[PDB]
Symmetry: C3
Subunit: 299 residues, 3 copies
């Protein structure tokens, strides 16, 4: 599969496999985890997306069971992980309330646990998982810079940051943030006009798109009819067209697909087969927003 360079130091697969449901599968054995990773690799999807909090702080260890039992498998993938969200589950069950923690001490503890749980000495990309209204940017930026200098983390980014959050944390760091993982799909189009995507495009930062299929709501009329029509014109399913709509954007959006289904992994690359011309991009955008683009103001 085509590669995307987020920076001179980090290259992903153009589509990323989200592992947030890996702990929900009835099968969490090393063998089934390896099978899922091997199905991705068969399609050239090498990038796995994790977070400390997934599975109530167990999804990384479940991935680790796979990796620790298959020597050589970690060298074939990039691992994205995240920290900053503290819910009273698993190892954080002492917690009195759901909160964010962007402190140097917490980031280091979470990274040490990610490395322990997945059986590796480095993660390819670490994201601050949510913007913290209590962030000390100086402290957080120093911790993130030291994690890169150490080699434990190849690159750093953020998730769900607004442009002003991104700007504040980048002002406190020597290393450049290489991504912002944000909701983007035909059902979530605000970032295209509200400044979120423009900011990233001006900074030459690729976003990672979460819920790129619209979070299950798109498949459950006019939008779906057009996705199915284009798919049938190009020999792919409506799912591939909804991902290709993201891939078409010149901001170089990196979709994160989160299925436990080996047959949807088998077809995930079909999005790269879609030719999405400018007019088709607008047809889908207009059906999704439910109204025509603004025409001449003088009318």
């Amino acid at each position: 599969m085509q590669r995307i360079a987020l920076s001179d130091k980090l290259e992903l697969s153009r589509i990323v496999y989200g592992m947030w449901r890996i702990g929900d599968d009835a099968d969490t054995s090393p063998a089934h985890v390896q099978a899922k990773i091997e199905a991705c690799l068969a399609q050239g999807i090498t990038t796995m997306d994790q977070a400390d909090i997934y599975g109530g702080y167990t999804a990384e260890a479940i991935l680790g069971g796979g990796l620790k039992a298959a020597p050589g498998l970690r060298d074939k993938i990039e691992i994205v992980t995240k920290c900053g969200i503290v819910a009273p589950a698993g190892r954080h069950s002492s917690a009195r309330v759901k909160h964010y923690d962007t402190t140097a001490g917490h980031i280091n503890v979470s990274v040490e646990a990610s490395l322990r749980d997945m059986g590796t000495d480095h993660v390819d990309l670490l994201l601050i998982h949510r913007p913290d209204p209590l962030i000390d940017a100086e402290e957080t930026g120093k911790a993130l810079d030291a994690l890169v200098a150490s080699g434990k983390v190849k690159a750093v980014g953020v998730s769900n940051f607004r442009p002003w959050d991104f700007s504040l944390l980048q002002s406190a760091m020597s290393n450049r943030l290489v991504t912002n993982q944000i909701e983007m799909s035909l059902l979530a189009t605000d970032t295209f006009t509200n400044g979120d995507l423009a900011y990233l495009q001006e900074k030459r930062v690729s976003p990672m798109a979460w819920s790129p299929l619209g979070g299950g709501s798109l498949f459950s009329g006019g939008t779906m009819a057009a996705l199915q029509r284009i798919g049938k014109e190009q020999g792919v399913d409506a799912t591939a067209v909804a991902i290709a709509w993201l891939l078409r954007h010149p901001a170089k959006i990196v979709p994160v697909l989160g299925t436990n289904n080996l047959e949807r992994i088998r077809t995930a690359a079909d999005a790269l087969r879609v030719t999405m011309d400018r007019q088709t991009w607008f047809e889908l955008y207009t059906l999704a927003i439910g109204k025509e683009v603004a025409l001449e103001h003088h009318h």
Copy 2:
């Protein structure tokens, strides 16, 4: 009429004549087009505002009929035109959907058609007509820079851009964008407090105000009574006061007036006769917003 320098390379009349309705007139003859331009020139209004899309891609050619039959008339005016909006009309009737196109190829084709249609070798100002959610800023900025270097376009700006759109496109260009054509009037006051006008004021960019009379809704109670009162105090009509309210702002707003009526052209300059002191500016602003300005927070 008083001149306004948008830059060292482009100077307009302080009021601009919008030609978006020129094709709606029952009379589209060269003679009637010349009459309208000559009525503007009689009031010192030298700047004409066009767009490729006006008249379903025919308004420029209708202006051209006037200019081509009156040698010397083009040298007396500045021409603003715009591109980026593609509706299925006239030469774009093959189009499947209403969309934006900011590609180098489309901008060049639209500019070549503007020059052909108006019978000139240059336009004074070219605007991207709407912010394109699919913009490639690098590509668009290269096309706009080459159009300036070529002499085909004296200066470039945008229309309906948010500050983040303006910032993204300017980051990709060597030439400075000299304006943003946005809605501003007593019925459209959001830009005064929402950051749109502050951004332009910090960049020392004059906006062009579209629908400066409120788009026909202002004339169709308290606001109109005050405009009529001030006009009767200063020997002008309520229309001149509504334009002078824009002219008073220190951001150096350039109103675009869009009438086919020779008698409203004859009086358009009366706005420059209005003395609009700070208190009068606030009286009108407060009547328009329908509530007092925020006073001391401690109360």
Copy 3:
């Protein structure tokens, strides 16, 4: 009381005494004004917050009655004052409408009146009281710079500015704006996520928080029960906990407390006795917003 350096030139008390109600007290005698200032000084609160408009342009003169009758008292305090709001009261009663005035002439007249009314040759901090939709930033910034160079004003800031207002005025000034006085409390939490506080945090500018108790609405269920519980755990009242919630933020927020009650002045410093850990900060923030913080987007 702990000091806060807004800059190399200006240091306040970490809590500020707002004098906006000083004219509402039945007692406005010099003796009662001195008593209030002496109650603050007894708690290490040295910073007094004024504005030209307070008391309909009489509150400064009422403070002055106190200061002029107590030689040496002005040297013990810092004075913050503000201008820019013109209401038809007192010396501005000729005014036809409520408006803003950020002109050099008005700022100078207001500062000269603040110095005359309080009987001093300098103010520690001058704020533009409200963002003016008619601001000429070049003119206002020149007036503010000259006021600092003159020694009449030790430092300048703003009040109720949005980030774009702050950015515009700072672009026109040589001196750095040292604060933005904005609404911040458990009932006013928008600035924590909407970019207002992030902007100030990136610029290393401390905000001053007005209505830090929520403007009387907080004391008049779940939020109050938690403030009372934490206070009873730490030997202080719920008021001290609501102020400590602001003091905990790493942006170094400076609360402005506006009581005429000598017994609430006597206890105002109790906020500095509160230990507010990250989880407690989130518990209060969550009770105030009325919903959990956003958890993992993948769920």
